[PDB]
Design a protein around this nucleic acid. Structure first.
Lengths: 110, 48, 43, 120
RNA sequence: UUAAGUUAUUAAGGGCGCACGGUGGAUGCCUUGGCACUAGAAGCCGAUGAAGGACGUUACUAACGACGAUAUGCUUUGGGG
RNA sequence: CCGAUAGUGAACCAGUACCGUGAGGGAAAGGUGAAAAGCACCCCGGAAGGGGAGUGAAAUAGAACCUGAAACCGUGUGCU
RNA sequence: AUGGUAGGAGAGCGUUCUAAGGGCGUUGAAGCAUGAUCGUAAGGACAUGUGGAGCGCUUAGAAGUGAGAAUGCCGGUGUGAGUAGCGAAAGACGGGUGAGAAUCCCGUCCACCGAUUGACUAAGGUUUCCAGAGGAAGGCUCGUCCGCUCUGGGUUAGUCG
RNA sequence: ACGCGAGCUGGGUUCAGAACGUCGUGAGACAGUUCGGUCCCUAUCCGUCGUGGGCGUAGGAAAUUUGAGAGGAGCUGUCC
RNA sequence: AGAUGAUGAGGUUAAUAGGUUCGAGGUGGAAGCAUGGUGACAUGUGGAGCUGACGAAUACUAAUCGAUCGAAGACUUAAU
């Protein structure tokens, strides 16, 4: 039994979001939330909102108890990048990269 | 300033093995609230 | 530093612009070329 | 001693403003380096206020800002007056101490360690 | 109680296989815009404003038509339902 | 026969964005319909999701309904 | 008895049509992209995806025919680092507002320019001016401002030009 | 690489100015003198001083010292 | 001790380490009052500030209950 959520086109570059995504992988949902609360990184609040969305999915739509759930998968894919011309330097380009954050949570049973 | 050869995938990822985040502290909240930073009355639910 | 192109409205209407181009024959040829190309602004 | 990322005059000015606002308000929130420096400044001020005579009142005027305080029952004192009047009476038995520091989390725009420094 | 041999137990990395990304056009489509034949013109207007535009006009308003202050049109003859 | 790097520069917003004082130079981007029937309805966070729902002969067929592919690149699993 | 960037006469395939014949196809037929076959070829007959209505085979003819480089061109795409840099100057604290504040607003203190980083008038620019409200982008943040949206708008001369 | 300019200088030579001697009809030349005259780079596949994390680790493991050499440091001299 | 990390001094018996407060060591003559002087000033009251970087006292100071990490001795072979 697995619930998931994705957040699409989040405006943080994927290298910066995979760093904190490596912390919560394979842990329990409660201690995952605690790890996300005690890291000062720009993407801990985004990821925490996706994780709370997936736990809400599991409780509401599949009637899983939210105290047994572990974070089964957590990953970040590249979304579409936006190209900006930096005027501040000399006419060289800057891409705003964006990402897709997927979290899936489960009770380990079948 | 320039690289003669491009670096491969394997050399890039060998360079990134120390480039990662350490696990935080977590002295737990015994009175009330969320788990707070170690040796803190942290600003979100601190009951140290 | 001072640049090329220091704008001036009267000068711009006086060296280019419709009545100056219609006043010579080569100027009328630039307006005929620009019509024939279908330009939105003739001058 | 710490430099706090400032030139010599800027640092002196910042520490005088910090110590004055702590006297005004009795707990303030700042970064952890700054509060670790303002410990010493405000504790020597409270020492001067406990000593109490004219010479130390004139020494204390060298550091405090000239700030007016709207007091309960609509009164007004300066901070030199609150220091030599009220705060010096609280600490007349305590020998040293007088300030406590409590940590908070990081700020949002940097990861600066916030801190509350309070009078005890 | 000595000499000797040996292996895991991380895969940070490697090859294979798996599975969701980004990407953008391989397949199929299009035929709106022209190569050429036939025919017709007549090359085409107006000092009756000729020649391309500018401002406007819809109940609501942002580019072409009408051309136009009679303005998102007016009269009339004939089709048509 | 052009079958759309096309008879055309332009079958889309084209001599237009834009560039140049001016003569002038000059793009990119095309593509339901089976029928919007375009996720009423309804439930958790603004965006985005998870569910049901649908005209759905088929939405990993959700505004990228011309579908729609590849490769580069990915990224998370693992067998050795 | 049987090699040659230069050599002659060779059998063959992708696109198209004739010019045909014969098939696979709206109980599905593709092609195309993922499959064990054919192979020196180039090039085609049976498991996923696709759709959801288009292709093959045979013989012959015609070539916008004919796909690793040209400091090739580009519809173009994407890499090679958490590196360089973030463009002169003094800020601190309290309150407020908020989903969220080194950033926005109010306060107090401090500071800087002061023949000017002040106040007017030209040229030039053309709605940036003023209020509300969300800012999906914009700003070398956030919006919780304007330089996106709505209008609510808003420019008044006998004597100024 | 008459060791060493991605370590530094730029006096010399030699680029545009200018002058003298001399040669040339001339434009100019000589290299004969003379005064003046812009020298770039964020260090990467890599190769080259200091300072850390781990693959090891064979009783569990942890606190207390080999000295093979990979070794490195050469240290000279004058007057009473 | 240090770019960071490492090293070292230390942490709820805990001052410990740092700050503080009282000290002294070392560095440089007060405010107030009085006296004299017409006044500028001088003198007395008497080595004042500092302690910014060099002892004692402290809980002001952290770890909240803290929590986490870390074996089942090879085997063999023959030599007891």
């Amino acid at each position: 039994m697995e619930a998931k959520a994705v957040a699409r086109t989040i405006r943080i570059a994927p290298r910066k979001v995979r760093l904190v995504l490596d912390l919560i992988r394979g842990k329990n949902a409660a201690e995952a939330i605690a790890i996300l609360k005690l890291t000062n990184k720009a993407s801990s609040p985004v990821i925490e909102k996706v994780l709370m969305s997936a736990l809400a999915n599991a409780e509401h739509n599949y009637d899983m108890n939210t105290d047994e759930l572990v974070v089964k998968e957590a990953y970040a894919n590249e979304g579409p990048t936006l190209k900006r011309f930096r005027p501040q330097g000399r006419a060289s380009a800057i891409n705003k990269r964006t990402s897709h954050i997927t979290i899936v949570v489960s009770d380990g049973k079948e | 300033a320039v690289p003669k050869r491009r670096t491969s995938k394997t050399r890039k990822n060998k360079r990134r093995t120390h480039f990662k985040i350490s696990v935080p502290g977590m002295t737990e909240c015994p009175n009330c609230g969320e788990y707070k930073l170690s040796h803190r009355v942290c600003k979100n639910c601190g009951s140290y | 530093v001072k640049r090329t192109y220091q704008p001036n409205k009267r000068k711009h209407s006086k060296v280019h612009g419709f009545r100056k181009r219609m006043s010579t024959k080569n100027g009328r040829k630039v307006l005929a070329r620009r019509r024939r190309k279908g330009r939105k602004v003739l001058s | 001693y710490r430099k706090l990322g400032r030139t010599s005059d800027q640092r002196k000015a910042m520490l005088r403003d910090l110590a004055t606002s702590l006297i005004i308000s009795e707990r303030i929130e700042t970064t952890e380096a700054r509060a670790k420096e303002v410990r010493s400044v405000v504790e020597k001020l409270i020492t001067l206020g406990k000593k109490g005579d004219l010479a130390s009142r004139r020494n204390a005027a060298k550091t405090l800002r000239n700030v007016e305080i709207l007091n309960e029952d609509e009164t007004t004192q300066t901070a030199l007056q609150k220091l030599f009047g009220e705060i010096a009476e609280r600490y007349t038995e305590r020998q040293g101490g007088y300030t406590r520091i409590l940590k908070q989390g990081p700020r949002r725009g940097d990861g600066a360690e916030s801190v509350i420094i309070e009078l005890v």
